[PDB]
Scaffold this active site. Sequence first.
Site, PDB file in Angstrom:
ATOM      1  N   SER A   1       0.816  -1.212   0.000  1.00  0.00           N
ATOM      2  CA  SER A   1       0.000   0.000   0.000  1.00  0.00           C
ATOM      3  C   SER A   1       0.846   1.257   0.000  1.00  0.00           C
ATOM      4  O   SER A   1       0.292   2.355  -0.194  1.00  0.00           O
ATOM      5  CB  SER A   1      -0.924   0.074   1.207  1.00  0.00           C
ATOM      6  OG  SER A   1      -2.011  -0.880   1.194  1.00  0.00           O
TER       7      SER A   1
ATOM      8  N   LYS B   1       0.475   3.689  -2.956  1.00  0.00           N
ATOM      9  CA  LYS B   1      -0.646   4.614  -3.082  1.00  0.00           C
ATOM     10  C   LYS B   1      -0.184   6.046  -3.132  1.00  0.00           C
ATOM     11  O   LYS B   1      -0.885   6.902  -3.688  1.00  0.00           O
ATOM     12  CB  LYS B   1      -1.656   4.377  -1.976  1.00  0.00           C
ATOM     13  CG  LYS B   1      -2.280   2.987  -2.037  1.00  0.00           C
ATOM     14  CD  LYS B   1      -3.274   2.731  -0.946  1.00  0.00           C
ATOM     15  CE  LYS B   1      -3.768   1.304  -0.898  1.00  0.00           C
ATOM     16  NZ  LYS B   1      -4.662   1.101   0.203  1.00  0.00           N
TER      17      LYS B   1
ATOM     18  N   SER C   1      -6.078   3.689   3.824  1.00  0.00           N
ATOM     19  CA  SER C   1      -5.568   2.613   3.003  1.00  0.00           C
ATOM     20  C   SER C   1      -6.694   1.793   2.370  1.00  0.00           C
ATOM     21  O   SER C   1      -6.630   0.564   2.301  1.00  0.00           O
ATOM     22  CB  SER C   1      -4.541   1.764   3.677  1.00  0.00           C
ATOM     23  OG  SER C   1      -3.559   1.297   2.731  1.00  0.00           O
TER      24      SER C   1
ATOM     25  N   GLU D   1      -5.107  -3.482  -7.235  1.00  0.00           N
ATOM     26  CA  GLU D   1      -5.533  -4.095  -5.986  1.00  0.00           C
ATOM     27  C   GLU D   1      -6.533  -5.203  -6.283  1.00  0.00           C
ATOM     28  O   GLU D   1      -7.428  -5.019  -7.105  1.00  0.00           O
ATOM     29  CB  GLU D   1      -6.204  -3.074  -5.079  1.00  0.00           C
ATOM     30  CG  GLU D   1      -5.311  -1.913  -4.705  1.00  0.00           C
ATOM     31  CD  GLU D   1      -4.214  -2.290  -3.754  1.00  0.00           C
ATOM     32  OE1 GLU D   1      -3.387  -1.314  -3.479  1.00  0.00           O
ATOM     33  OE2 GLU D   1      -4.125  -3.415  -3.290  1.00  0.00           O
TER      34      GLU D   1
ATOM     35  N   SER E   1       1.243  -3.504   3.916  1.00  0.00           N
ATOM     36  CA  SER E   1       1.384  -4.875   4.385  1.00  0.00           C
ATOM     37  C   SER E   1       1.090  -5.796   3.216  1.00  0.00           C
ATOM     38  O   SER E   1       0.297  -5.443   2.338  1.00  0.00           O
ATOM     39  CB  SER E   1       0.422  -5.119   5.481  1.00  0.00           C
ATOM     40  OG  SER E   1       0.479  -6.406   5.924  1.00  0.00           O
TER      41      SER E   1
HETATM   42  C1  LIG Z   1      -1.740  -2.117   1.680  1.00  0.00           C
HETATM   43  O1  LIG Z   1      -0.608  -2.487   1.926  1.00  0.00           O
HETATM   44  N1  LIG Z   1      -2.846  -2.882   1.764  1.00  0.00           N
HETATM   45  C2  LIG Z   1      -4.144  -2.270   2.072  1.00  0.00           C
HETATM   46  C3  LIG Z   1      -4.326  -2.151   3.583  1.00  0.00           C
HETATM   47  N2  LIG Z   1      -3.171  -1.300   4.026  1.00  0.00           N
HETATM   48  O2  LIG Z   1      -3.335  -1.011   5.403  1.00  0.00           O
HETATM   49  S1  LIG Z   1      -1.892  -0.751   6.029  1.00  0.00           S
HETATM   50  O3  LIG Z   1      -1.309   0.311   5.236  1.00  0.00           O
HETATM   51  O4  LIG Z   1      -2.271  -0.335   7.367  1.00  0.00           O
HETATM   52  O5  LIG Z   1      -1.122  -1.922   5.963  1.00  0.00           O
HETATM   53  C4  LIG Z   1      -4.230  -3.514   4.229  1.00  0.00           C
HETATM   54  C5  LIG Z   1      -2.946  -4.215   3.859  1.00  0.00           C
HETATM   55  C6  LIG Z   1      -2.632  -4.226   2.362  1.00  0.00           C
HETATM   56  C7  LIG Z   1      -3.398  -5.289   1.602  1.00  0.00           C
HETATM   57  N3  LIG Z   1      -2.933  -6.513   1.803  1.00  0.00           N
HETATM   58  O6  LIG Z   1      -4.336  -5.097   0.850  1.00  0.00           O
END
Ligand SMILES: *C(=O)N1C[C@H](NOS(=O)(=O)O)CC[C@H]1C(N)=O
Length: 261
Positions: A43, A46, A103, A139, A210
Amino acid sequence: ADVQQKLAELERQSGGRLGVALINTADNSQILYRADERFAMCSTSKVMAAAAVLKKSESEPNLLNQRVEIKKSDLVNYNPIAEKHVNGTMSLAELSAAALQYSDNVAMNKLIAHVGGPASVTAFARQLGDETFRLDRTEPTLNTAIPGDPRDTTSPRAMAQTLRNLTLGKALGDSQRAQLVTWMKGNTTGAASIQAGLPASWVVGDKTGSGGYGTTNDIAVIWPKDRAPLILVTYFTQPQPKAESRRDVLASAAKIVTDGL
Ligand SMILES: *C(=O)N1C[C@H](NOS(=O)(=O)O)CC[C@H]1C(N)=O
Ligand SMILES: [Cl-]
């Protein structure tokens, strides 16, 4: 020597692979650890997508007010804001804020789509002078973070340099830069990551991420108290597909590289 030893010890203890780049604008110095290796952005990508929309808006002033339909078919794995707007529209400004501050992955997909897709986000990076960044997928698949897979990766050095340009430099017009900075400072998701390794009084704008393989990331612009700002990238990933998050490793890295400032 000392900081390097401390980062290698942290990496060893963590069991994974740690990438750090700190730019200190006080003296134009850097602290680098695996800073030319690739890591899955997850993420943290972004920021580049939101910046691409902001760039686009420089030649289309009413762009951020443009309305985007949200449908059930847009929902992905993590839709904290978009799920509230299904069957209505959100503005590009609202999508940017949702992507950056909560996010929201639907919001990211709308930013990506708007500008023409992952290859357009990548072309924007190139136009800025970042020849490392690659956004390959949308995504939610961009977060798989498989070891050895170059898709959706960058290096800590490149991302630190690019985040510096975007937030502190001249990549974006003044209004757009200010908006990016305000959005990042209003992030709600970062308290456990870089922020957790810095004194409470420091002001931070960050974007976490993550993914698979216990990938745990954060990128930040930091205003220490009465000091020139810093830019810090901390990327981390692990050997096991289903490894646990390790936000604490990011906090520890931040503490190591800022100790004394
Ligand atoms: C980004 O890494 N994603 C979207 C969301 N991000 O939240 S975080 O920045 O607090 O990690 C959840 C994790 C991730 C995903 N796996 O889609
Ligand atoms: Cl403190």
